[PDB]
Amino acid sequence: YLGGPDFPTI
Amino acid sequence: MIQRTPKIQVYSRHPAENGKSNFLNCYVSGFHPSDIEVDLLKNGERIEKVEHSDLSFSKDWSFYLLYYTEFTPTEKDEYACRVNHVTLSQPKIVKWDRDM
Amino acid sequence: GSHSMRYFFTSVSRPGRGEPRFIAVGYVDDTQFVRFDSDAASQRMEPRAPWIEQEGPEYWDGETRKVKAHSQTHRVDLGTLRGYYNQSEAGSHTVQRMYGCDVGSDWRFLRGYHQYAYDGKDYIALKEDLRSWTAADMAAQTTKHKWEAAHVAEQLRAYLEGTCVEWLRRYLENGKETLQRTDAPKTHMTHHAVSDHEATLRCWALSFYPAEITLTWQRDGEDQTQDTELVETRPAGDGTFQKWAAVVVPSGQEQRYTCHVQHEGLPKPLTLRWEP
């Protein structure tokens, strides 16, 4: 089960 | 950046016995970047139908892939894996030895 | 024993035309169970182990949405990183991300991780406390300050200590027949005479799972590394692993040497000796 739904950008 | 050349092992899934069906594996690992060309060869000629695993990587970020195909070894036929990568000025051929 | 769930993501930019190639794989222990490849036709998260096929459409839709989102973030990052490092638009570059959680034998949270690399080198990683970051250089230090201001570690921590563990346990239970099975190595030794006076003994470990294994040679009960060779553990292709270790010995003295095999699937380590 993935993380999420948001993953900030670098 | 860092370019790291592939390590290569060529081996059968099962102990090889002439006339018995098996799987020929070429395991390439330790490389970066990920683009790589790998063929399996029977008597020098490219085998069609070869499959590979999904790209993954190790703790040091280097990539690894398994390429494989069904095959039926014999006493006479020779098998190898041929690899090209940005780190290689020529494709590298590694011959299958049934005892390694 | 302990277990893990881990996801691995690779994006490779394509300066000539188009979007980055994106490949995602998910593992429980040494078992791959899902993949996404942006070049595959489905444009879906795809099962790679049987025990995941029972998840319902709600699951697959959500994993597909999340994995696509991950791919978009990596696309953006490739652009930003190319500027941070003052690189040309001409070259292809790579972003890699791995995250996941470990549980102990008790199936309770042991540790979490989230690591990112640019062109094959560390960029930024969550520390073991899941509250702070390790930035490798001054570009990543700007990322670290941004992510600390936005409280990203707190959101990731909630996933890695909570959700990740819960789903890992669900998969362990659902995939019990394989994921909780330990396949001890099937071992044997071969002998090869190089000359009349020296011989190579090769200790084989075949068809084992998980991949972790130790093969040692001893001479008269003492560890020997000189005159030995050890190949990297390699996949069989059927979900199991293979390894061998060899030693060169004086012909006639084979019986002095022992090969010692340690693996989670062995209640006690195995000792092999040539008297065939």
Residue numbers in the entry:
A (entry chain C): 1 to 10
B (entry chain B): 0 to 99
C (entry chain A): 1 to 276
The authors write:
We also solved the structure of each unligated APL to investigate whether structural changes occurred before or after binding — which, combined with an in-depth cellular and biophysical analysis of the 1E6 interaction with each APL, demonstrated the molecular mechanism mediating the high level of cross-reactivity exhibited by this preproinsulin-reactive human CD8+ T cell clone. Competitive functional testing revealed that the preproinsulin-derived sequence ALWGPDPAAA was one of the least potent targets for 1E6, with only the MVWGPDPLYV and YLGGPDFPTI demonstrating a similar low-activity profile in MIP-1β secretion and target killing assays. Additional small movements in the Cα backbone of the peptide around peptide residue Asp6 were apparent in the A2-YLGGPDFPTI (KD = ~400 μM), A2-ALWGPDPAAA (KD = ~208 μM), and A2-RQFGPDWIVA (KD = 44.4 μM) structures. The weak binding affinity between 1E6 and A2-MVWGPDPLYV and A2-YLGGPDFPTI generated thermodynamic data that were not robust enough to gain insight into the enthalpic (ΔH°) and entropic (TΔS°) changes that contributed to the different binding affinities/potencies for each APL. The potential requirement for a larger degree of induced fit during binding to these weaker-affinity ligands is consistent with the larger entropic penalties observed for these interactions.
Here, we solved the structure of the 1E6 TCR with 7 altered peptide ligands (APLs) determined by our previously published combinatorial peptide library (CPL) screening, 2 of which mapped within human pathogens. Ligand engagement is dominated by peptide interactions, but hotspot-like interactions with the central GPD motif enable the 1E6 TCR to tolerate peptide residues that vary outside of this region, explaining how T cells expressing this TCR may cross-react with a large number of different peptides.
